[PDB]
Amino acid sequence: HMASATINLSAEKQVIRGFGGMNHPVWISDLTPQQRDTAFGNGEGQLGFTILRIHVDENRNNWSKEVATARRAIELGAIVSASPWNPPSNMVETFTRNGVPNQKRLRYDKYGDYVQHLNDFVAYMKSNGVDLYAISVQNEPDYAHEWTWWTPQEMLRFMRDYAGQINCRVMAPESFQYLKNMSDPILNDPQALANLDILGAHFYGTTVNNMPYPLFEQKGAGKELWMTEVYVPNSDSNSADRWPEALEVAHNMHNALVEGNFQAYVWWYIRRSYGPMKEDGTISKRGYMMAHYSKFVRPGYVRVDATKNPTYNVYLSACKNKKDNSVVAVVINKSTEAKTINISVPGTSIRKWERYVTTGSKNLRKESDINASGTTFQVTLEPQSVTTFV
Amino acid sequence: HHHH
């Protein structure tokens, strides 16, 4: 039997900003020179990442450790965003939170000093050849057992009365789970919303039903939407090549893009035993899942409407290159059976797709071209696979 | 749940 899907090139959705991951040379080892190239180049055997995330150290004597990786990322065409975990210690005080004592927050009398600390980091990185794309108010203000807590109202006061002085695009609030209570106050206050440039969110435990954001569709004109940190489905030691488990990475990216309208998807540590690049410097199954998007859906491409679930266990997304109206379709098949789909692309002059396939036994393998019959491309997806058509 |  034969399933169907339609890609509508005239129904444009979000512009793609890019894909990438975290570097943190204070908590773990920096990327090496060769690993910087594997991450940020887009040749064969490279990931094609176009976003680097870094941390803003509370101790300025550590800032120089960021520079070499961030410079090489930019030279290879990536953008850089930075997130703080704590303010300098002289700006912090303690409080008791839900009966747990000794918890950290920014002193209310130090909000202006904290603006200056962020600006000092921006200017230091600029002096060193790293013009940051954006800087965040706080990493996970709502999951801060091990760092600095901010309530929705503390975040709001900072966004409204201080964030306009930051000499960079401002990212907020980076909830651990995209909890809307952290961001609704910013969207609902005209001055706080003016001082926002990127709505940042993490995805830990975020379900599909919680990926849409009606208030952001209503009030978010001119603001970018980025998923700035996750790992999925777990951080188990030495898990990065497990199959078919790695398919959950692809699915979570599909869901960010299509269910959440996200413009960016950013992993936690780039190099790690559960990450996209293994400790031996080679790409993991989880990394190939990312690569099906990152190598092909380049910054400035625009997502378009496409049948998202054409048959059980099959998931489709499509993005268009506005330079020539060509399309990139990424199709996941979680079934133990092969699936054949007629994909209609009305109004296209394109008549041939190339395809790259990942299964448990091959990585980004170039398979036989698809020749269209008129504007319909009939494709067959191997069981337990991801295919990118270009 | 995470980073723990």
CA A205 – CA A194 distance, rounded (Å) = 30
Tokens of A159: 């966004």
CA A264 – CA A256 distance, rounded (Å) = 9
Q: Which of A140, A174, A224, A382 is catalytic?
A: A140
| Cα of A384 vs its chain's centroid, Å | 24
Question: Would you tell me which residues 1-4 of chain B have a C-beta closer than 8 angstroms to some C-beta of chain A?
Answer: 1-3
Tokens of A41: 């180049």
> Is A354 an active-site residue?
no
Contacts of A231 in chain B (CB under 8 A): 2
Contacts of A235 in chain B (CB under 8 A): 2
Between A and B, how many CB-CB pairs are < 8 A?
A: 9
Report the b/e string of A58-80 with b at 16+ CB within 10 A: beeeebebbbbbbbbbbebebbb
Residues A247, A248, A252, A254, Cα dihedral to 10°: 20
Give the residues across from A357 on adjacent strands: A365, A387
Max Cα-Cα span within chain B: 7
CA A228 – CA A45 distance, rounded (Å) = 24
Contacts of B3 in chain A (CB under 8 A): 146
Determine the residue of chain A that is closest to B4 in CA distance.
A235
Give the residues across from A7 on adjacent strands: A306
Tokens of A226: 């980025």
Q: What are phi and psi of A329, to 5 degrees?
A: -110, 130
Q: Do A146 and B1 touch (CB under 8 A)?
A: no
Look up residue A290 and give its amino acid. M
Max Cα-Cα span within chain A: 68
Strand A51-56 vs strand A18-22: parallel, antiparallel, or unpaired?
Answer: parallel
Q: Which of B2, B3, B4 to mutate to test the interface with A (most CBs of A within 10 A)?
A: B2
Pick from A313, A320, A308, A329: nearest CA to A377: A329
Query: Which resolution, in Å, applies to this structure?
Result: 1.4
Contacts of A146 in chain B (CB under 8 A): 3
Q: Do A235 and B2 touch (CB under 8 A)?
A: yes
Radius of gyration of chain A (CA): 21
Report the b/e string of A370-390 with b at 16+ CB within 10 A: bebeebebebebbebbbbbbe
Instruction: Enumerate the domain spans of chain A.
Output: 1-16+300-390, 17-299
Q: Do A205 and B1 touch (CB under 8 A)?
A: yes
Q: Which residue has the tokens 């790259």?
A: A356
CA A330 – CA A33 distance, rounded (Å) = 31
Give the residues across from A353 on adjacent strands: A370
CA A318 – CA A64 distance, rounded (Å) = 40
CA A244 – CA A383 distance, rounded (Å) = 10
> Is A140 an active-site residue?
yes
Tokens of A317: 């997304």
CA A267 – CA A256 distance, rounded (Å) = 12
Q: From residue A37, give the alpha-carbon distance in Å to each of A8, A243, A300.
A: 36, 26, 22
Q: What are phi and psi of A189, to 5 degrees?
A: -110, 120
Pick from A72, A53, A74, A39: nearest CA to A291: A39
Q: Do A205 and B3 touch (CB under 8 A)?
A: no
The DSSP result for A287-345, as a single string, is HHHHHHHHTTS-TT-EEEEE-S-SSTTEEEEEEEETTTTEEEEEEEE-SSS-EEEEEE-
Tell me if A142 sits within 8 A of A169, measured CB to CB: no
Q: What is the 3-state secondary structure (H, E, C) of A54-116?
A: EEECCCHHHHHHHHHHHHHHHHCCCEEEEEECCCCHHHEEEEEECCEEEEEEECHHHHHHHHH
A72: alpha, beta or left, given left = phi > 0 and alpha = psi -120 to 50? alpha
Fold observed for domain A17-299: TIM Barrel (3.20.20)
CATH number belonging to domain A1-16+300-390: 2.60.40.1180
Q: What are phi and psi of A251, to 5 degrees?
A: -60, -40
